[PDB]
Amino acid sequence: SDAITIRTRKVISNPLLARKQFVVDVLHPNRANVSKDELREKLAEAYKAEKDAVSVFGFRTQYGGGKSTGFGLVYNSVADAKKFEPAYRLVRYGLAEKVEKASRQQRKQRKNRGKKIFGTGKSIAKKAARRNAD
C-alpha cells in the first residue's frame, strides 16, 4: 500500500537548453517525502533516460501530507546536464565534487595582501630578509 505514483505536469520541451521541463506532482499516501534520488531514478526509467540526465528540486510536501510538488528537468544527454546545470546540483547528485575553496573572509584578506605588493613578491621577500639581516 506504498505505491509512490508520479506525474509530470506542464511539461515543455526546450532544445534551447536540450531539456524537458516539468512540475513534479508525486502522490504518496502513508509515507513521508520521496527522497529525491529515488524519484530521480523513477523519472529516469519513466522518460527512458539515465539517472544522470535527470534533476529534481524545489520540492514541497503539501499541508497534511500525501501529495508533494517540485520542479524537474530531463536533459537529452548526460554531457548536456554536466555542461548546463549549476555546480551545486552536480554536487548533490555526486556527478561533481565540492570545490576546495577557502572561506570568503580569508580570500578577501589575501586579496588585500596581494594589493599591498606591486608586482610579484619574489624580489621583496629576499630584499626584506637581507634588510633585517643588517
Partner: protein, 260 residues
Amino acid sequence: ARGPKKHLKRLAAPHHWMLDKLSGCYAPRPSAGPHKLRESLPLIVFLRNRLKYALNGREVKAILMQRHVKVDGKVRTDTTFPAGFMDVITLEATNENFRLVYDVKGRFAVHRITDEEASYKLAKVKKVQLGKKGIPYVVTHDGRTIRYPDPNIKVNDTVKVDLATGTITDFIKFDTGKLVYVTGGRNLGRVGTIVHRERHEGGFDLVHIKDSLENTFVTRLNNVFVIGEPGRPWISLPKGKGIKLTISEERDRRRAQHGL
C-alpha cells in the same frame, strides 16, 4: 546623481514587464539600444518570464550566448537587449518566430507568428532628413537609418523593411481611413481606423480612432502607428485584434467560453 544610472529597482520597472514585486530587489535595466527602456522589453524578461524557456539569469545567459536568439536577423548576445515593439525574435531551435505586439490589456504578449512573414518587419517613420553630400535618409522608430528612401515618404508614415537587406520594400501613407495601432497610454494595444486628425497648430497632433466594434477614442500622433488598410492589415494581429472588450464583456467571455 553624477553621471548615468545603471540600476533599475524592481518597483521602478514598467508595469508592462509586470514582474513579481517580491523575489528580487532589482529589475533588468535594458541596455542602450533601438528602443526607449520604458517602451522596450529586455530579452531576459522575454525568455525567463514570458516564455519560461529559462529559469533564471544564468540560463538566459547560456541561451543568448550560444546564438539561438536572433533579434531582427541579428544575434544580440547581450542579456538586457531592448527588444522593442514590432521586433522579430527568431529561435532556430523549435524553429519559432515571435513578433512583439501589445495585447489589448497593453502588454508585450507572446505572439507566435509564421516564418514566411518573419522575413520582414514594419516600422514607423520618425524623421526624414538630408544628410551630408545631399543624401536623403529616413529615421524609423527603431533608430534604423535607411539611406535613399522613396522621395514622397514623409514623417509619421509607415514602411516595410525587408529585415534581410535592410532597405525599403513598400510603405503606407498616413491619412484618414487607415488601419492603425496605438503604442502608448491608456489605449495600449488598441487597433482601429483613423477617422480624423486634428492639426492643432503649435504642437501635439491628435487623431481620432474608431475600431471594428464601432467604439471611438482619441490619441496623440506620437502615440500612433499605421499598420495597414482596413480589412487588410500588413501583419498578423494578435488574438483578439485589440477590440478592448469591456470588463463586463470580459466576464461574459470568461463565463461563455468555459470548459473544465
